[PDB]
PDB file of C-alpha atoms and ligand atoms in Angstrom:
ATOM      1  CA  UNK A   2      30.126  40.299  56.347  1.00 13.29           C
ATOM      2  CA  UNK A   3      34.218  39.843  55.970  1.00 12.00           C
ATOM      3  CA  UNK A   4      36.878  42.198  55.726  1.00 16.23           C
ATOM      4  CA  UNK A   5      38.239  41.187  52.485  1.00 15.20           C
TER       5      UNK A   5
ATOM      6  CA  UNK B   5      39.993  50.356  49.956  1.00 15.45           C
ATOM      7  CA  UNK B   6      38.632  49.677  53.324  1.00 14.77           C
ATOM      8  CA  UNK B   7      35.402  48.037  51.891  1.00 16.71           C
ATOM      9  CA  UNK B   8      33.711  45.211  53.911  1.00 11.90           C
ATOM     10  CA  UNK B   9      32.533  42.291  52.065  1.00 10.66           C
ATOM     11  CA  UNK B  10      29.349  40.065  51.854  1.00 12.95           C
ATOM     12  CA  UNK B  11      30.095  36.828  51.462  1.00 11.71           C
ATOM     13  CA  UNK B  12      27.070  34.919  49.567  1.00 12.71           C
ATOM     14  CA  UNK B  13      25.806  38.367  47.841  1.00 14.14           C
ATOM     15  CA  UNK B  14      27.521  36.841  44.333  1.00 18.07           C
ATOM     16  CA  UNK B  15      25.679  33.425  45.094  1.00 18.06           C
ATOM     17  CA  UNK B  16      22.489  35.404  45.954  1.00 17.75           C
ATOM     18  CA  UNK B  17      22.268  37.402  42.803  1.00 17.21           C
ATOM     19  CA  UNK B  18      23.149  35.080  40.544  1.00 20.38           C
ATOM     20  CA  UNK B  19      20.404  32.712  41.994  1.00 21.16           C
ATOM     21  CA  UNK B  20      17.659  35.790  41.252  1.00 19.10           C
ATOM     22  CA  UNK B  21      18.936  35.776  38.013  1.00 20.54           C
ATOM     23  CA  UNK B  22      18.260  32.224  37.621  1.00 18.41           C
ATOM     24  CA  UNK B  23      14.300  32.762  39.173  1.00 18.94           C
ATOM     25  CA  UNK B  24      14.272  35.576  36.491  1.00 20.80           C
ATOM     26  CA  UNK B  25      15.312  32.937  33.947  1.00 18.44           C
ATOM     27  CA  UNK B  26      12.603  30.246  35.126  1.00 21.32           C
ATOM     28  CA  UNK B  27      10.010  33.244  34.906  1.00 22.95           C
ATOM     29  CA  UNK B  28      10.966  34.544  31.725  1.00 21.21           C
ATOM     30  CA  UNK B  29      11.013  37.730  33.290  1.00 19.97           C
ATOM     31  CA  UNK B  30      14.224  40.010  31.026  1.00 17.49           C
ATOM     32  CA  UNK B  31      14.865  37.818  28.962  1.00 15.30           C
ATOM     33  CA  UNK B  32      16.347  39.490  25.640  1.00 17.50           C
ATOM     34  CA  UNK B  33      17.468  36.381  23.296  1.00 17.14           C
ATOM     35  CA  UNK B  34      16.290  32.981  22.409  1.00 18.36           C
ATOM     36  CA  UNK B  35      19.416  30.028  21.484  1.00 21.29           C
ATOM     37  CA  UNK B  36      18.100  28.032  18.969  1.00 19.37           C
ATOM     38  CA  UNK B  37      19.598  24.436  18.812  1.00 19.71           C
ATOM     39  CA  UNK B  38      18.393  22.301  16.417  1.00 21.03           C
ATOM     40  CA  UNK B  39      14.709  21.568  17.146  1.00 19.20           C
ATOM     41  CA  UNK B  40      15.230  23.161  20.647  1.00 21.14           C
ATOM     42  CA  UNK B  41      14.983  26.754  22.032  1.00 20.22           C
ATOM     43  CA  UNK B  42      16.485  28.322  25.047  1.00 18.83           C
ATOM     44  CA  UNK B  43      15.453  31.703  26.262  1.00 19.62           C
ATOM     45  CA  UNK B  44      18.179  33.245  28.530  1.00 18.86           C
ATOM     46  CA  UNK B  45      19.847  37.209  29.116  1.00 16.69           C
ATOM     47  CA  UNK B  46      22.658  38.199  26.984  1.00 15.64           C
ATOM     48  CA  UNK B  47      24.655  39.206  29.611  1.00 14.61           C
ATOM     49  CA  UNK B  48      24.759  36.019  31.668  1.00 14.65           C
ATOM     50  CA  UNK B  49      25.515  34.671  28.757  1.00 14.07           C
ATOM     51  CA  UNK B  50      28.325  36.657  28.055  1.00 15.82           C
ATOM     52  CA  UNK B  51      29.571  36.772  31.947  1.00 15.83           C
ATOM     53  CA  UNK B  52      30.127  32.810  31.301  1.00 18.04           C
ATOM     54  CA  UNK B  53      30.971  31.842  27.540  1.00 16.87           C
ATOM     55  CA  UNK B  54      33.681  33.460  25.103  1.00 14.35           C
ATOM     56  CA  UNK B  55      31.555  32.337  22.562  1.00 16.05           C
ATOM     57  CA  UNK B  56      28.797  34.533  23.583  1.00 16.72           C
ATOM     58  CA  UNK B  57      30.648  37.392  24.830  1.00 15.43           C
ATOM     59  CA  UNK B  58      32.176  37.881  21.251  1.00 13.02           C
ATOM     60  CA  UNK B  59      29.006  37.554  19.908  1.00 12.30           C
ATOM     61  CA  UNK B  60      27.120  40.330  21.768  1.00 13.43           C
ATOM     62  CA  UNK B  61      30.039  42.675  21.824  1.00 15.38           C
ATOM     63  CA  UNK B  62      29.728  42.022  18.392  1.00 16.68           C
ATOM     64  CA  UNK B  63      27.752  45.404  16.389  1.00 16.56           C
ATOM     65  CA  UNK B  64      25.242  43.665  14.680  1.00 14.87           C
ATOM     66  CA  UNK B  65      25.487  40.470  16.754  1.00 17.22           C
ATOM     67  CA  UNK B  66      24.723  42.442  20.008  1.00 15.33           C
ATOM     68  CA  UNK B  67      20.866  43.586  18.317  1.00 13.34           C
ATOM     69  CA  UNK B  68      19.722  40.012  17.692  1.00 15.55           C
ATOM     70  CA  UNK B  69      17.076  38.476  19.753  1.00 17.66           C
ATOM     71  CA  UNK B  70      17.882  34.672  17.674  1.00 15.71           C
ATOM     72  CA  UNK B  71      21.060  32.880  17.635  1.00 18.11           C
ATOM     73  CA  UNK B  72      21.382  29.562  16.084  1.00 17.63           C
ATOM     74  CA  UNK B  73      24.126  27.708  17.311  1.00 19.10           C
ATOM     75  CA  UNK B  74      26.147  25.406  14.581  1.00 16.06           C
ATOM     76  CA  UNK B  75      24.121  21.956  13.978  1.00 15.68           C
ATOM     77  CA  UNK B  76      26.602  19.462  15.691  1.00 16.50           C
ATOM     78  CA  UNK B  77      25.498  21.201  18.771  1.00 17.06           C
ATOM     79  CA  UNK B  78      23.638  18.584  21.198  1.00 16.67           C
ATOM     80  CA  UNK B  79      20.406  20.452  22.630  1.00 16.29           C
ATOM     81  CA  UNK B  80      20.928  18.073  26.100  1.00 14.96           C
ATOM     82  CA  UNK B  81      24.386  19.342  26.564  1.00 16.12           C
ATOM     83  CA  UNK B  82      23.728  22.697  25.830  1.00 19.00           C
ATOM     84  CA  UNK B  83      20.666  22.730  28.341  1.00 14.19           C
ATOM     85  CA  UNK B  84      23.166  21.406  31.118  1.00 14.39           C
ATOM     86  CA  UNK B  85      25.789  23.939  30.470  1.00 14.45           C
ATOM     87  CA  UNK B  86      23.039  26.921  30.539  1.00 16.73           C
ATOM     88  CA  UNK B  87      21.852  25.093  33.779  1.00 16.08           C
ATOM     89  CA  UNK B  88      25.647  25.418  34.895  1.00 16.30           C
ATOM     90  CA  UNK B  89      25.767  29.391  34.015  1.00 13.88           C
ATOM     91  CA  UNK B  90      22.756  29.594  35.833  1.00 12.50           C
ATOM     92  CA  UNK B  91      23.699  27.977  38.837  1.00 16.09           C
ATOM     93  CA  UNK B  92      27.199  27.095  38.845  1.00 14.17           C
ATOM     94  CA  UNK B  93      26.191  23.411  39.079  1.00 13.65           C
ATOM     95  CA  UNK B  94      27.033  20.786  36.309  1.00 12.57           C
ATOM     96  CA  UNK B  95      24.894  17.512  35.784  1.00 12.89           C
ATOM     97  CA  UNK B  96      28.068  15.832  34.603  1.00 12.77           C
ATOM     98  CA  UNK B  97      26.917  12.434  33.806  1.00  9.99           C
ATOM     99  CA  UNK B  98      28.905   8.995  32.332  1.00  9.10           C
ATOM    100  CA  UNK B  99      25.890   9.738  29.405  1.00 10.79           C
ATOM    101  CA  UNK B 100      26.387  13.207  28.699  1.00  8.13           C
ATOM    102  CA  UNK B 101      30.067  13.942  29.116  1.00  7.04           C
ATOM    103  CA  UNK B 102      31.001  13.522  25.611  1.00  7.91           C
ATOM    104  CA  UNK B 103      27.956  16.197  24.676  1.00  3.90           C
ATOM    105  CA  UNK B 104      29.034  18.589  27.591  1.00  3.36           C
ATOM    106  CA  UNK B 105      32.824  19.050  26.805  1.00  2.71           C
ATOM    107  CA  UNK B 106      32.614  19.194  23.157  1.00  5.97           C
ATOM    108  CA  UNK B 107      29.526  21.952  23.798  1.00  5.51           C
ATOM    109  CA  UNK B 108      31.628  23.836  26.337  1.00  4.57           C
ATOM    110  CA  UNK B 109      34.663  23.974  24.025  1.00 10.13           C
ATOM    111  CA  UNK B 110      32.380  25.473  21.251  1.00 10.60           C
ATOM    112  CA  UNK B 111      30.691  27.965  23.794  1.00  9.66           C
ATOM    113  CA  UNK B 112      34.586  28.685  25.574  1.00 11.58           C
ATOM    114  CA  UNK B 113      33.678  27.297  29.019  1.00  9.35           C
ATOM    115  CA  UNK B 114      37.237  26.510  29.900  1.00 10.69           C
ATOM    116  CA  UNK B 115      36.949  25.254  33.502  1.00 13.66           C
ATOM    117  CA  UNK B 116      34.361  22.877  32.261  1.00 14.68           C
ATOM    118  CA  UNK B 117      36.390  21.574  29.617  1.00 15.67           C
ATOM    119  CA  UNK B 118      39.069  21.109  32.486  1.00 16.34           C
ATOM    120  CA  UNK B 119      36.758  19.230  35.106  1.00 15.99           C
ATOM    121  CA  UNK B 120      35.288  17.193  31.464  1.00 18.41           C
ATOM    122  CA  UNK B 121      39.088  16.620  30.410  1.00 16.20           C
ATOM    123  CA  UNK B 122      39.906  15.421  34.314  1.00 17.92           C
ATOM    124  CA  UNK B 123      36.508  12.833  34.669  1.00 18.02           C
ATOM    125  CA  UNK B 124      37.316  11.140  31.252  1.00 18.99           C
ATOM    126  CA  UNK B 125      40.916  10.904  31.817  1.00 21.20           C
ATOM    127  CA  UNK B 126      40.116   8.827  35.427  1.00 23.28           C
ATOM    128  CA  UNK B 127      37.711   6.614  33.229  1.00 24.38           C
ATOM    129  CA  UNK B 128      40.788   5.561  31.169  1.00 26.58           C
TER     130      UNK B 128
ATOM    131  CA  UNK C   5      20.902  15.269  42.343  1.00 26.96           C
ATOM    132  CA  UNK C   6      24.392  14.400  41.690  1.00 30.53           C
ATOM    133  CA  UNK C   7      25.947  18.013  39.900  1.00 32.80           C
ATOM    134  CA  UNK C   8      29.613  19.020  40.684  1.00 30.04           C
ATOM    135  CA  UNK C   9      29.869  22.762  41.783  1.00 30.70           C
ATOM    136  CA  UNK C  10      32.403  25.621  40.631  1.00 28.19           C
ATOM    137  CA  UNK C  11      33.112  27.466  44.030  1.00 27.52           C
ATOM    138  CA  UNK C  12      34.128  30.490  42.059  1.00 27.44           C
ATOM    139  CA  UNK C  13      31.547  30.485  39.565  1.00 27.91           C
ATOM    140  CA  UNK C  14      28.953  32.600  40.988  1.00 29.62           C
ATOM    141  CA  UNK C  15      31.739  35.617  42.008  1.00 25.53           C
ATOM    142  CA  UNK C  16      33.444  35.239  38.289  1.00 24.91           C
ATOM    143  CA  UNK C  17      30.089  35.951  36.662  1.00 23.81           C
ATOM    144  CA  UNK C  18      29.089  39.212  39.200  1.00 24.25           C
ATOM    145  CA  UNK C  19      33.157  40.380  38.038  1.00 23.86           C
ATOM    146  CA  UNK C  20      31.983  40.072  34.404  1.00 23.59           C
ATOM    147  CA  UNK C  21      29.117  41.831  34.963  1.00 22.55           C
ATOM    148  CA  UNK C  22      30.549  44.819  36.525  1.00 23.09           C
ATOM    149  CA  UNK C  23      33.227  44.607  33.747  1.00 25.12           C
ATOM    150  CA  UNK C  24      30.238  44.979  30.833  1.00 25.84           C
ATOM    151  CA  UNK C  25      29.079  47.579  33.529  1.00 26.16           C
ATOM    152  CA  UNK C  26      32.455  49.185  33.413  1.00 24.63           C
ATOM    153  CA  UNK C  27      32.051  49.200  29.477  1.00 25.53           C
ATOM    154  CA  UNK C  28      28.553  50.602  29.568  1.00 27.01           C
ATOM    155  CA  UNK C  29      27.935  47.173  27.486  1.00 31.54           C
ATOM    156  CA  UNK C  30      24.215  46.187  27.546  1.00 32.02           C
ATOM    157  CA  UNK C  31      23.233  48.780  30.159  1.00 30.99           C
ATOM    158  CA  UNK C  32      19.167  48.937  29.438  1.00 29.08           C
ATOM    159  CA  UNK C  33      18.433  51.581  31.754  1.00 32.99           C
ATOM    160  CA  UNK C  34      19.983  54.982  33.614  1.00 32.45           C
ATOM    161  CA  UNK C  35      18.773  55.680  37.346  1.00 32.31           C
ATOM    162  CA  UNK C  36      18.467  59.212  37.879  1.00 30.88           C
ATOM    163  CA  UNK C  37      19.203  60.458  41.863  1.00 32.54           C
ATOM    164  CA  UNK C  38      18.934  64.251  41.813  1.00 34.63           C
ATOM    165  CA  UNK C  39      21.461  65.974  39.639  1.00 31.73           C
ATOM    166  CA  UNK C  40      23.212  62.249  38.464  1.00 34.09           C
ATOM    167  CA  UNK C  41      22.962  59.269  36.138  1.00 29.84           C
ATOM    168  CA  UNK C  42      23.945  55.951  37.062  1.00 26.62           C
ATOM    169  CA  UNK C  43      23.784  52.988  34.035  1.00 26.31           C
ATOM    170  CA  UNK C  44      23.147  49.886  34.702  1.00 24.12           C
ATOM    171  CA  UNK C  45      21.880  46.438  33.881  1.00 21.11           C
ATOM    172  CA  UNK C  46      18.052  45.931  35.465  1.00 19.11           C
ATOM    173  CA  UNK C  47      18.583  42.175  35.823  1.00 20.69           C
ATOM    174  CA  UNK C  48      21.655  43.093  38.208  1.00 18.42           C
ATOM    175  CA  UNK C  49      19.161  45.891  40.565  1.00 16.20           C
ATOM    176  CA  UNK C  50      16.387  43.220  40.474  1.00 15.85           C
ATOM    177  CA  UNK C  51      18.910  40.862  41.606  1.00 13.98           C
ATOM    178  CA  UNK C  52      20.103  43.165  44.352  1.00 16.33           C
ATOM    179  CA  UNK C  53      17.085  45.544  45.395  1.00 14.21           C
ATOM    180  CA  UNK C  54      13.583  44.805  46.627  1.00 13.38           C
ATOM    181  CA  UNK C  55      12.846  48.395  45.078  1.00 10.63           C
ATOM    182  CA  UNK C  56      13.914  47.607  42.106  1.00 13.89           C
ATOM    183  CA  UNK C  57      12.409  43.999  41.782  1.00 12.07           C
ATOM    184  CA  UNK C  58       8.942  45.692  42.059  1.00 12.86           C
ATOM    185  CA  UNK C  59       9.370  48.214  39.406  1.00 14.08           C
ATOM    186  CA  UNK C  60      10.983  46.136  36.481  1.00 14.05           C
ATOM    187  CA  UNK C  61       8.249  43.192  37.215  1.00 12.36           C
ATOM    188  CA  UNK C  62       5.469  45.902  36.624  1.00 12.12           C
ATOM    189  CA  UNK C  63       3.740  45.737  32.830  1.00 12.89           C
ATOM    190  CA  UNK C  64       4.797  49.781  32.329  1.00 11.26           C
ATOM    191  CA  UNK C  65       8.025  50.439  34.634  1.00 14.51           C
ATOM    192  CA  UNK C  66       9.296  47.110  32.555  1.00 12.96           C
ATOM    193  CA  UNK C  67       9.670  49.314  29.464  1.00  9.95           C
ATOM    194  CA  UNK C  68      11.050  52.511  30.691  1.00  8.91           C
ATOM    195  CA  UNK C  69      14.716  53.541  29.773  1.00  8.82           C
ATOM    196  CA  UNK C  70      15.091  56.014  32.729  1.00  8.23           C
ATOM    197  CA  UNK C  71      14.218  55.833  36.555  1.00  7.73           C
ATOM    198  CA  UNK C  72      13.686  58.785  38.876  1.00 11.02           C
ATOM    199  CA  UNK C  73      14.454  58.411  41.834  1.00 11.86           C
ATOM    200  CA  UNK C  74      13.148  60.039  45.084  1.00 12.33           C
ATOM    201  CA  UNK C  75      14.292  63.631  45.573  1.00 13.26           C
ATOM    202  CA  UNK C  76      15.483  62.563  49.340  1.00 14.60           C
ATOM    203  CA  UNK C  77      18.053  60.215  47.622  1.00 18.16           C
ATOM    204  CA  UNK C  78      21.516  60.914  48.301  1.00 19.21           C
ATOM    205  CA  UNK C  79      23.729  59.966  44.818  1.00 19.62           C
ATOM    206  CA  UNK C  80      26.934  58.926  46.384  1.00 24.43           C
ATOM    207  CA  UNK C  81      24.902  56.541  48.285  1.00 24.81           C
ATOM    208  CA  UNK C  82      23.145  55.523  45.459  1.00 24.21           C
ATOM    209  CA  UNK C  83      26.769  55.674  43.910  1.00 22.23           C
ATOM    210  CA  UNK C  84      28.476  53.359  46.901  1.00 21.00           C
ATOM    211  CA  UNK C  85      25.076  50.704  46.813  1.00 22.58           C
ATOM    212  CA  UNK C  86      25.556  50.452  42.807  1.00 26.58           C
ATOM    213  CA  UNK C  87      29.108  49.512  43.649  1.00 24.81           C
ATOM    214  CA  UNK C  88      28.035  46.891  46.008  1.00 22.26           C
ATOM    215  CA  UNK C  89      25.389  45.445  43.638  1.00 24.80           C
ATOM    216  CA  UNK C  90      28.247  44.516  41.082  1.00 22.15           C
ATOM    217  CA  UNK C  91      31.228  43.843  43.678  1.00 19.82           C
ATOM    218  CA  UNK C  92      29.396  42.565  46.728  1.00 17.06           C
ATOM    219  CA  UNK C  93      32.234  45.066  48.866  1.00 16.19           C
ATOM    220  CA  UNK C  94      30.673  48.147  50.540  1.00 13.51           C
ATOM    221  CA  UNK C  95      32.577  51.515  50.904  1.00 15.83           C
ATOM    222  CA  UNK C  96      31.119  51.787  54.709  1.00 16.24           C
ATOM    223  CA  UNK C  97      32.317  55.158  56.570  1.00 19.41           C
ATOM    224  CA  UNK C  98      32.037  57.400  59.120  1.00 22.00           C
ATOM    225  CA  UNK C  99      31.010  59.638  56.565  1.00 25.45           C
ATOM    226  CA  UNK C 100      28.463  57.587  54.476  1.00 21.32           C
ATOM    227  CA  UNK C 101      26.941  55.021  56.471  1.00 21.47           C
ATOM    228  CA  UNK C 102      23.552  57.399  57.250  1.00 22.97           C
ATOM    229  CA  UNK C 103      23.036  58.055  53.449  1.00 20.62           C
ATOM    230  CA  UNK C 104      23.879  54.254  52.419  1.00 23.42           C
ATOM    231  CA  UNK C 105      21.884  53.228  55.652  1.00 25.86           C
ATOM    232  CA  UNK C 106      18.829  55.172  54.381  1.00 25.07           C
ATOM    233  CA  UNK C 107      19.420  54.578  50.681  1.00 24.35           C
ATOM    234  CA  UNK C 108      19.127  51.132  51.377  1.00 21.16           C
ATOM    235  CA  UNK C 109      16.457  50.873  53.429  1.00 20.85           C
ATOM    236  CA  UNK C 110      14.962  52.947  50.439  1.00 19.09           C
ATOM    237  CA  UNK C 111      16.170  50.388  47.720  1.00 20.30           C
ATOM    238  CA  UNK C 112      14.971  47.918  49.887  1.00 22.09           C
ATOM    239  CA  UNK C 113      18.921  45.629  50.578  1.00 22.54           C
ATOM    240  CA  UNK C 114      18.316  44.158  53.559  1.00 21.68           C
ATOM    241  CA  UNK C 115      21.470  42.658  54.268  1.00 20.69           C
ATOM    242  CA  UNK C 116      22.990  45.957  54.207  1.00 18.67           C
ATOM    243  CA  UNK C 117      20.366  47.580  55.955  1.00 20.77           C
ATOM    244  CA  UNK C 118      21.371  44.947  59.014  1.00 17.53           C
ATOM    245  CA  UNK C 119      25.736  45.379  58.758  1.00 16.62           C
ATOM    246  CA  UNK C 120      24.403  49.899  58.658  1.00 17.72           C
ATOM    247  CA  UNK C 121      22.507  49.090  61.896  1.00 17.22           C
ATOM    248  CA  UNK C 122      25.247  47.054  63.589  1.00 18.00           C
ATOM    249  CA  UNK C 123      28.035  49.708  62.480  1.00 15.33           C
ATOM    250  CA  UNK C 124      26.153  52.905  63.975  1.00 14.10           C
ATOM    251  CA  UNK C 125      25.513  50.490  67.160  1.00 16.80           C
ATOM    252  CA  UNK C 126      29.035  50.041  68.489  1.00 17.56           C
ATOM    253  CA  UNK C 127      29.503  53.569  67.760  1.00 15.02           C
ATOM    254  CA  UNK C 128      26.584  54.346  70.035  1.00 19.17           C
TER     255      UNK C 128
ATOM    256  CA  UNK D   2      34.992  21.757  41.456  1.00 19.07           C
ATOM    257  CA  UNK D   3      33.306  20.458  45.114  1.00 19.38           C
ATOM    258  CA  UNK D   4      30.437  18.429  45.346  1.00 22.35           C
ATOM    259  CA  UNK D   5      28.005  20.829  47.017  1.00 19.63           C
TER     260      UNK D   5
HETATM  261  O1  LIG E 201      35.915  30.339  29.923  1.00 18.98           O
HETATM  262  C1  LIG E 201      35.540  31.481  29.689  1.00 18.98           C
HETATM  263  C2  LIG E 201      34.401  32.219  30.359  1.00 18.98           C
HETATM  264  C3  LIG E 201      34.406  33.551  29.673  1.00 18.98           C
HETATM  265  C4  LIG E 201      33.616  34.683  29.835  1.00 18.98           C
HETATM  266  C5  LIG E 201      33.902  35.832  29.100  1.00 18.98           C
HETATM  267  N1  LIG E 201      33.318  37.015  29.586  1.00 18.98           N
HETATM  268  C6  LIG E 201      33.878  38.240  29.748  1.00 18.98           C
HETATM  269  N2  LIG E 201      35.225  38.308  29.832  1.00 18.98           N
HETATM  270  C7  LIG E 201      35.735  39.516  30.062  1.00 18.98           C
HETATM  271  N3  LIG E 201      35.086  40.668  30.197  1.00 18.98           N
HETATM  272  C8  LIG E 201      33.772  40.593  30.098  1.00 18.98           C
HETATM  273 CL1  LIG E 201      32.944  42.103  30.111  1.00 18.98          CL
HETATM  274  C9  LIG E 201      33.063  39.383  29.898  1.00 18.98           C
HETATM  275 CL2  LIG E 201      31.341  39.346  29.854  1.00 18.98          CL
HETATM  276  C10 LIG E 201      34.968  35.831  28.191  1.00 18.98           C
HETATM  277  C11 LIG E 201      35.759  34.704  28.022  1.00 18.98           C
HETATM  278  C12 LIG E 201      35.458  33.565  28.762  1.00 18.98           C
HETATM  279  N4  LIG E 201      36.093  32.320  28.773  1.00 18.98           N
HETATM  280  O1  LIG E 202      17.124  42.616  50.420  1.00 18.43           O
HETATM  281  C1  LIG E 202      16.608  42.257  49.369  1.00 18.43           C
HETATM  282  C2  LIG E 202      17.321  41.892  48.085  1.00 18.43           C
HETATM  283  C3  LIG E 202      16.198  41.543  47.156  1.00 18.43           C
HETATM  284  C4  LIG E 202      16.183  41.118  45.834  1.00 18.43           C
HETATM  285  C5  LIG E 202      14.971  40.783  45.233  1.00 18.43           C
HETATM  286  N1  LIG E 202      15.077  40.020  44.056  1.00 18.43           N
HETATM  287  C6  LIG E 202      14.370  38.923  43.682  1.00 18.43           C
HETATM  288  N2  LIG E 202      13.754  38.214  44.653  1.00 18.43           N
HETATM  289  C7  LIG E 202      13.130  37.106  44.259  1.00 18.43           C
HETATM  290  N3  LIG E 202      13.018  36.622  43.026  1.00 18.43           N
HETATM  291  C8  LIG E 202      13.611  37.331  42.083  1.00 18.43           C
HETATM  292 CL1  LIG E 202      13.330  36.795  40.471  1.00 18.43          CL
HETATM  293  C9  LIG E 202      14.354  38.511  42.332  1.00 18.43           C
HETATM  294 CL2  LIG E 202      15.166  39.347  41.064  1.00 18.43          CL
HETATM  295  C10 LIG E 202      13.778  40.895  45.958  1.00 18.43           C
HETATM  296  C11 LIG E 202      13.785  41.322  47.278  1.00 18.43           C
HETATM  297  C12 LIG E 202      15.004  41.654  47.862  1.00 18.43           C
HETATM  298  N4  LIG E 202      15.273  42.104  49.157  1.00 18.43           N
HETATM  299 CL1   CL E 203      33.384  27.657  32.861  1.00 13.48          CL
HETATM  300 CL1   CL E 204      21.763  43.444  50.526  1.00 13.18          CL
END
């Protein structure tokens, strides 16, 4: 999971 | 927004779709080229060709469960380039290169017409 | 083998796909969660949910138009999962994440079942 | 396009  | 995002989740579903595919499981057409037959889902098909999205936003079109494809259409290229939707790998081969950018114009693939454009240029 | 790859392949076709979403284009089935109705594509949930895998691969559930699901089902979960499916970004907040926690564990997602868990841990 |  990544902040976009 | 302040969304968080999953990284592979786009790789991950469309490689279900492709197990789907392989299993026949949703399938809702059948691309007839020449002697050959492809079974695949409309809306892949439409999510990766401008050929096939016109086709099945198309009325009529979109309630047809055959589509013939014109007859200079090589079977072999076509079955690479649904490979390619599938997976988002090409089998781009000194062979079949010819076959896979003239298909992929016809189907409106432009980013493989670019890479096909790019290897037959270097072979010049 | 020896295939070239498209790195962006995989995300263009999920942004198609929620754009033919978006459209209500091809949409074979509506999920029902209490009082709301949620289109969609069951290729895309099958692609996404263990839940959903199971019913569409049964002989009957294959065939049905509409889905029902359980009562304890909170919509805008539902709602912000059904988002993810097509995007792969998740609306996480303080607000949501024990309705999309338990929605997912529901719809069986296990990768966001796992970031929920993590999330409510450092809060802990 | 990468080789993968
Ligand atoms: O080279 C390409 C690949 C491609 C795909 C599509 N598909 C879609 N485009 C926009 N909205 C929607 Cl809803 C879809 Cl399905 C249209 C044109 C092209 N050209
Ligand atoms: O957390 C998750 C996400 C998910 C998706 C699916 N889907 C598929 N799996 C295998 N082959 C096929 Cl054909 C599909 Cl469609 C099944 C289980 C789970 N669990
Ligand atoms: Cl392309
Ligand atoms: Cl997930």
């Amino acid at each position: 999971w990544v902040i976009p | 927004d302040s969304c968080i995002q999953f990284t592979r989740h786009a790789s991950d579903v469309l490689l279900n779709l492709n197990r789907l595919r392989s299993r026949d499981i949703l399938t809702d057409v059948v691309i007839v080229v020449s002697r050959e037959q492809f079974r695949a889902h409309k809306t892949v098909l439409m999510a990766c060709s401008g050929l096939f999205y016109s086709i099945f936003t198309d009325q009529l079109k979109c309630n047809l469960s055959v589509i013939n494809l014109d007859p200079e259409i090589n079977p072999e290229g076509f079955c690479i380039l649904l490979d390619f939707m599938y997976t988002s790998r090409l089998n781009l081969r000194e062979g079949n290169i010819m076959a896979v950018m003239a298909t992929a114009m016809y189907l409106q693939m432009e980013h493989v017409v670019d890479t096909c454009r790019k290897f037959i240029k270097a072979s010049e």
